[PDB]
């Protein structure tokens, strides 16, 4: 397995998309905590897999920019993958950014940091069927990209994951992956294109 992702080598992000790139990476983390908290993770000085404790389970801006600019980066490439696939993104709708409301999580989510995630309630943002085919590409590119950095880091495939060694159970082509994760991946990137709409951006090629 060698992942061959889309060549974003020549795409350059325009400055008017800095806000939406920033404002998207802000929500990808709020979904991250929410999902971790739903699996039982808590806050800790450093990550503890045994205790299920994470240090980066803090407000987005408070993150270490080493582990924080990975959000902006992994999201910057998520916008630069759209321009490559033929789109152009334009902020056409002014009124969207005000009706935008964030989810009210139950109070048991607030932790030692007094921090409770607030994902966007993109409940009614139902993407047009053309925008669904787009997600399946991004949902697939996200795997080939994530696996591409793995092999350069040195990683290999194992029966189950060994955190110490380079062995992982999901360094396989997209065809071998499980339906649960394939949908899990596209569940997030569906919620990402929903964010461009939630702020009023048009995902239309000319
Ligand atoms: N350096 C890291 N920083 C933050 N999160 C990480 C890091 N490395 C791995 N993860 C998390 O690990 C997850 C992948 O783990 P995997 O899906 O194999 O098991 P899991 O879903 O964590 O299992 P469970 O949630 O039931 O314990 C990713 O969703 C990611 O959030």
Buried b (16+ CB within 10 A) or exposed e, 87-109: bebebeeeebeeeeeeeebeeee
Given a contact cutoff of 8 angstroms between Cβ atoms, the answer to whether 63 and 117 are in contact is no
CATH architecture of 15-203: Orthogonal Bundle (1.10)
What SS3 state is found at 149? helix
- β-partners of residue 48 are 53
163 touches ligand 1 (CB under 6 Å): no
- Is 160 exposed, middle or buried, given 0-12, 13-18 or 19+ CB atoms closer than 10 A? exposed
39 touches ligand 1 (CB under 6 Å): yes
- Nearest 5°: the CA angle 200, 29, 127 is 35
Q: Helix, strand, coil % (nearest 5) of the chain? A: 50, 10, 45
Reported as type and span, the H/E element at residue 84 is helix 65-84
Resolution for this model in angstroms, one decimal place?
A: 3.1
Reported as type and span, the H/E element at residue 192 is helix 179-198
From 78, 194, 187, select the one nearest 141 (Cα to Cα): 78
Given a contact cutoff of 8 angstroms between Cβ atoms, the answer to whether 91 and 36 are in contact is no
The backbone torsions φ and ψ at residue 6, rounded to the nearest 5 degrees and listed phi first, read: -65, 140
Q: How far is 30 from 58, CA to CA, in rounded Å?
A: 10
Method: X-ray
Q: How far is 135 from 131, CA to CA, in rounded Å?
A: 7
2 touches ligand 1 (CB under 6 Å): no
Q: How far is 86 from 133, CA to CA, in rounded Å?
A: 13
Sketch the domain layout of the chain as residue ranges. Answer: 15-203
Q: How far is 7 from 198, CA to CA, in rounded Å?
A: 28
Find the helix packing angle between 179-198 and 129-153, rounded to 10°: 120
């Amino acid at each position: 397995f060698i992942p061959c992702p889309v060549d974003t080598s020549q795409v350059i992000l325009p400055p008017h998309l800095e806000k939406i790139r920033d404002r998207l990476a802000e929500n990808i983390h709020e979904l991250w905590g929410m999902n971790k908290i739903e699996l039982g993770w808590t806050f800790g000085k450093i990550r503890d897999d045994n205790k299920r404790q994470h240090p980066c389970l803090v407000e987005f801006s408070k993150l270490p920019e080493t582990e924080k600019n990975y959000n902006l980066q992994m999201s910057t490439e998520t916008l630069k993958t759209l321009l490559a696939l033929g789109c152009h993104i334009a902020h056409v709708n002014p009124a969207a950014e005000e009706d935008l409301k964030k989810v009210k999580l139950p109070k048991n989510y607030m932790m030692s940091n007094g921090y409770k995630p607030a994902p966007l309630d993109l409940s009614d943002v139902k993407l047009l069927p053309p925008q669904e085919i787009l997600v399946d590409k991004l949902a697939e590119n996200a795997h080939n990209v994530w696996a591409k950095d793995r092999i350069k880091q040195g990683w290999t495939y194992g029966i189950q994951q060994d955190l110490k060694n380079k062995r992982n159970p999901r360094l396989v082509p997209y065809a071998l992956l499980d339906e649960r994760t394939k949908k899990s991946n596209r569940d997030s990137l569906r919620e990402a294109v929903r964010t461009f709409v939630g702020y009023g951006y048009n995902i239309e090629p000319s």
